[PDB]
């Protein structure tokens, strides 16, 4: 029973040991560094009054949605510092938010175990709820739109699910995690996705048939964030052990470890740039370090927030990055 | 400058801002009480996911977030409740003979809550529930089965006061927060009266720390 599973754990290990002939540092030691990245705050969004927990950009890289704990979903015009919409929420405990690729829908969720879909382009002119999804038993952590008809959600009951907006019922359930699943990331081709959980392990899933393909380990603490590379063949995880790590979907092992001796606090959000050269990680020491993802060097510090950084995200064209924090301020950096 | 439609877009954004501050003072006027501790007895007589109960008493609007249905890890959502006024913590008294010891599991929960980073400034209200059933249980069984260092008489007054002193002994940074201890009465409605009296002292200190006096 258990002895048959234990011997094949080494069968994963020795094939992975023979797979690793070199490291990423031994490949990229002969390239130039990106340099000390200094970038300032261009816009500051001051409308919120509680902690910001989630932020998602738009497809046109101008509108963004921010979720906070006072029960307000606010759509921001980041060019002119305007409030396009203000959506009151049924439950004030919100931990995730999402933006549709078509721009017609937004999502939110949290401790209420309910994912709400709000319609933005209705005839009446006011943002109203379109579909209420409630099939989970654990707290919602991350939700990402695939299109106007299906959405993938992460919950705290060690499961992920694939939904259908029109029917209102889930079509696929992704099971196999043992810890609380904390994040999601959708691939550029939108065929497969990852999920970081609290078992110090992130697993890659297929959207179509609904099975886990690969399992990635290496962290000694629980994972709070995940994000694919812009290539779609790689992703990165941010955990509570002050350590970011990079995985490859083909190599199926660790590549680089982004950590420093003076960093002790955990990581809340991790995102990549447009070219994938810069990894941006939001720590809990009131700042945000910019990690050069091919050199494991801190190439820039974003230290303009009073409280801890909880959410960050980079535009589709790479023009700007917005950082959310618990001091009720969104700051667009460029 | 701006076009004819950008002036109306900024004016629309200003009209939203007067509704955000209107709702901000509406939410800050009401008082939030996190409800921890393993609970259901205290809420039925005063009136999946997080269940919040809204009620008013003496022109003050209370809300109690019952998180007993959350079977997940408490560490990932206990920082969402750092902006509360008082944690209402419920301890049963008739589970000291029942068994891991059920009485000792409450002190492990009490140690984690008081030593949190996010609950240093926030006061904690302590409720000792089922005080009537403890009186019959202390006559048939001594309290020394839980504590081998138990001393004093085995009467109801000495045993109930002996449990209380260790609960306040687990409190650290005693200058910041004050633990209010009450014994629940099922017949009387004095339990909701103790909540209103305890929350009045916290918001006076909260009003005095806004100006800088206390």
């Amino acid at each position: 029973l258990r002895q048959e599973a234990e011997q094949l754990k080494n069968q994963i290990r020795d094939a992975r040991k023979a797979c690793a002939d070199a490291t990423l540092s031994q490949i990229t030691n002969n390239i130039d560094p990106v340099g000390r990245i200094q970038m300032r705050t261009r816009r500051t969004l001051r409308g919120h009054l509680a902690k910001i927990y989630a932020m998602h950009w738009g497809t046109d890289s101008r509108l963004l949605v921010s979720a906070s704990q006072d029960g307000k979903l606010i759509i921001w015009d980041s060019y002119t510092t305007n409030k396009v919409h203000a959506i009151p929420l049924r439950s004030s405990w919100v931990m995730t938010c999402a933006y549709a690729p078509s721009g017609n829908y937004v999502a939110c969720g949290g401790l209420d175990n309910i994912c709400s879909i709000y319609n933005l382009k209705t005839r009446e002119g006011n943002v109203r709820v379109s579909r209420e999804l409630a099939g989970h038993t654990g707290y919602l952590s991350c939700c990402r739109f695939l299109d106007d008809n299906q959405i993938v959600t992460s919950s705290g009951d060690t499961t992920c699910a694939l939904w259908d907006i029109e029917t209102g019922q889930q079509t696929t359930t992704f099971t196999g995690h043992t810890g609380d699943v904390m994040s999601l990331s959708l691939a550029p081709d939108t065929r497969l996705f990852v999920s970081g959980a609290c078992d110090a392990s992130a697993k890659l899933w297929d959207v179509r048939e609904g099975m886990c393909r690969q399992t990635f380990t290496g962290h000694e603490s629980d994972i709070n964030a995940i994000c694919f590379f812009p290539n779609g063949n790689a992703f990165a995880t941010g955990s509570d052990d002050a350590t970011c790590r990079l995985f490859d979907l083909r190599a199926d092992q660790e590549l680089m470890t982004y950590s420093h001796d003076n960093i002790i606090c955990g990581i809340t959000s991790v995102s990549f740039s447009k070219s994938g050269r810069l990894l941006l990680a939001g720590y809990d020491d009131f700042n945000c370090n910019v990690w050069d993802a091919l050199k494991a060097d801190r190439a820039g510090v974003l230290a303009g927030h009073d409280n801890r950084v909880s959410c960050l995200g980079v535009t589709d064209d790479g023009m700007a990055v917005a950082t959310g924090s618990w001091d009720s301020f969104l700051k667009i950096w460029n | 400058t701006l076009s004819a439609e950008d002036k109306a877009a900024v004016e629309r954004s200003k009209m939203i801002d007067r509704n955000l501050r209107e709702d901000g003072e509406k939410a800050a006027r009401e008082v939030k009480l996190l409800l921890l501790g393993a609970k259901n007895t205290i809420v039925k007589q005063m009136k999946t996911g997080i269940v919040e109960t809204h009620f008013t008493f003496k022109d003050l609007h209370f809300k109690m977030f019952d998180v007993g249905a959350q079977r997940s890890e408490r560490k990932k959502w206990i920082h969402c409740f750092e902006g509360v006024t008082a944690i209402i913590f419920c301890v049963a008294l008739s589970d000291y003979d029942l068994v891991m010891n059920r009485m000792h599991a409450s002190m492990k929960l009490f140690d984690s809550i008081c030593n949190n980073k996010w609950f240093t400034d926030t006061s904690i209200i302590l409720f000792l529930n089922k005080k009537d059933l403890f009186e019959e249980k202390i006559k048939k069984s001594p309290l020394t089965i839980c504590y081998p260092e138990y001393a004093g008489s085995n009467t109801y007054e000495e045993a109930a006061a002996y449990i209380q002193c260790q609960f306040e002994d687990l409190n650290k940074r005693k200058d910041t927060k004050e633990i209010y201890t009450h014994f629940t009465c099922s017949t009387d409605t004095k339990n909701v009266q103790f909540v209103f009296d305890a929350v009045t002292d916290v918001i006076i200190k909260n009003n005095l720390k806004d100006c800088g006096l206390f």
């Epitope: 305007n82 721009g103 005839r123 006011n126 | 076009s3 439609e5 109306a8 009209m15």
Partner: single-chain antibody, 230 residues
């Protein structure tokens, strides 16, 4: 969503009449409102405008002072007060709703319409009437005096369709944009000065009068009118 304008009828030049409309089916307090006047066998004329929450009120220069416009958000009723009436003010009055944010489509709905018995950009139509057989793609030209291209990068020109016997309908609200409920045969392109609307297929519902409107600066001025015939 409908707008039914009350009031109207016979009135002496010395008399004064109050015009009001009933708004239903939409969040009336979030929408800015307009009054647009259509003279008999002439082009459309803009009268007044209220922003959301009665913040900014603008008037046409010909009716400034004599006309008062007000709204009541709990009543969901928009009022126009007319104190001095000439022989020029005998015309049909329409009510238009519009909301202004990023990516918005203002002037998207028009009322049914009641009857009553110096430095402005001038909109001119090069053709008075072009009889078009169905199936032949045509372009309707609108010529402006001042360039409508703004610094933020969007030209403010609006295309309207006057079907015979009904209210105006918004087809295109900005250049390289299309309104909701309009088929894909309507396509528009713009330049610095000259603007055109290029339709491809023609049906019985596409016949009427086409009006180009500007929204760069108050007062808003409409086009002369490009009639189509069958």
């Amino acid at each position: 969503v409908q707008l039914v304008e009350s009031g109207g009828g016979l009135v002496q030049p010395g008399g004064s009449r109050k015009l009001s409309c009933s708004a239903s089916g939409f969040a009336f307090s979030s929408f800015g409102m307009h009054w647009v006047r259509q003279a008999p066998e002439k082009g459309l004329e803009w009268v007044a405008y209220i922003s959301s929450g009665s913040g900014t009120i603008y008037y046409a220069d010909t009716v400034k002072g004599r006309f008062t416009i007000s709204r009541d958000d709990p009543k969901n009723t928009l009022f126009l007060q007319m104190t001095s009436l000439r022989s020029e003010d005998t015309a049909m009055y329409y009510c238009v709703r519009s909301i202004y944010y990023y990516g918005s489509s203002p002037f998207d709905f028009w009322g049914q319409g009641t009857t009553l018995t110096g430095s402005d950009i001038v909109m001119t139509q090069a053709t008075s009437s072009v009889p078009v057989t169905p199936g032949e793609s045509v372009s309707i030209s609108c010529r402006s005096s001042k360039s409508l291209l703004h610094s933020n990068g969007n030209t403010y020109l609006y295309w309207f369709l006057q079907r015979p016997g009904q209210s105006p309908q918004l087809l295109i609200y900005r250049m390289s944009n299309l309104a909701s409920g309009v088929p894909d045969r309507f396509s528009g392109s713009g330049s610095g000065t000259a603007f055109t609307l290029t339709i491809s297929r023609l049906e019985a519902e596409d016949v009427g009068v086409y009006y180009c409107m500007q929204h760069l600066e108050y007062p808003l001025t409409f086009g002369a009118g490009t009639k189509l015939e069958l």
